[PDB]
Amino acid sequence: IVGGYTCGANTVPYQVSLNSGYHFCGGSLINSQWVVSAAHCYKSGIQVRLGEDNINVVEGNEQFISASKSIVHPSYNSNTLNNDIMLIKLKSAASLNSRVASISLPTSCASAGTQCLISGWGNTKSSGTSYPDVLKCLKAPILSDSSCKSASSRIITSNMFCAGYLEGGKDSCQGDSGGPVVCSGKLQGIVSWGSGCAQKNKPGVYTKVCNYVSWIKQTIASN
Numbered sequence: 726i727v728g729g730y731t732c733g734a735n736t737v738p739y740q741v742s743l744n745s746g747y748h749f750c751g752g753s754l755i756n757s758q759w760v761v762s763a764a765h766c767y768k769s770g771i772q773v774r775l776g777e778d779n780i781n782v783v784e785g786n787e788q789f790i791s792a793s794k795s796i797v798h799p800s801y802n803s804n805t806l807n808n809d810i811m812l813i814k815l816k817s818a819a820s821l822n823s824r825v826a827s828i829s830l831p832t833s834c835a836s837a838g839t840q841c842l843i844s845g846w847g848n849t850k851s852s853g854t855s856y857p858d859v860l861k862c863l864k865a866p867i868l869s870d871s872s873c874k875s876a877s878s879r880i881i882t883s884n885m886f887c888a889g890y891l892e893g894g895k896d897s898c899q900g901d902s903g904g905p906v907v908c909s910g911k912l913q914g915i916v917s918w919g920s921g922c923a924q925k926n927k928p929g930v931y932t933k934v935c936n937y938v939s940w941i942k943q944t945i946a947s948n
């Protein structure tokens with residue numbers, strides 16, 4: 726997260742860290758046994774870490790649970806990042822409490838101009854590298870498709886939306902992938918991609934979760 730602020734320990738209870746010996750992506754707890762993340766974060770031997778703030782210090786509220794199954798969207802295209810969403814099932818159900826809680830799926834798509842909360846342990850510099858140990862937060866509005874279908878160099882399908890600032894300076898970044906974008910109290914997006922970080926006229930692109938609710942519900946009901 727570039728240009729954000731320190732969230733504060735466990736203030737984003739649904740945020741998860743995907744660990745394969747080190748933190749490599751974020752995710753969101755949607756219920757006691759399922760996590761939603763980005764398909765491009767797929768990897769074998771994933772351990773889900775809940776109740777995290779400082780990912781390098783055991784603080785007492787963590788829950789480490791291995792993944793038993795990973796399901797990448799059936800139409801994921803790794804070249805265009807279309808349908809960049811994946812479901813991860815935990816080997817055992819997490820214990821939900823004040824510091825570990827699920828985030829609700831949307832019933833309608835968020836409107837342009839709506840302010841959202843993006844969080845993650847990703848790079849905090851637009852130029853160079855510096856990874857934080859504690860969770861960072863960013864307030865960012867959803868931009869009109871017009872505002873980036875002309876700003877984005879790659880293809881922006883109807884399964885993505887842009888959020889951020891055209892002036893640059895504030896944006897999600899490497900290591901934030903798979904993380905949540907929450908607007909109106911529901912999970913509206915997944916950190917997917919962008920051109921560099923916090924670059925002018927290059928806002929972040931996010932997976933539009935509202936278009937995947939049917940698939941998510943059907944999958945979790947049968948797995």
Ligand SMILES: COC(=O)[C@H](Cc1cccc(C(=N)N)c1)NC(=O)CNS(=O)(=O)c1ccc(C)cc1
Nearest residue numbers: 896897898899902917918919920921922923929930
């Ligand atoms: C990979 O290194 C990076 O600095 C960022 C990471 C990132 C991830 C998720 C969201 C954002 C964001 N800005 N909101 C940034 N991505 C890039 O810079 C990728 N752009 S790219 O133009 O470098 C590119 C595009 C396609 C391929 C195969 C490889 C590289």
Ligand SMILES: [Ca+2]
Nearest residue numbers: 779782783784
């Ligand atoms: Ca910790």
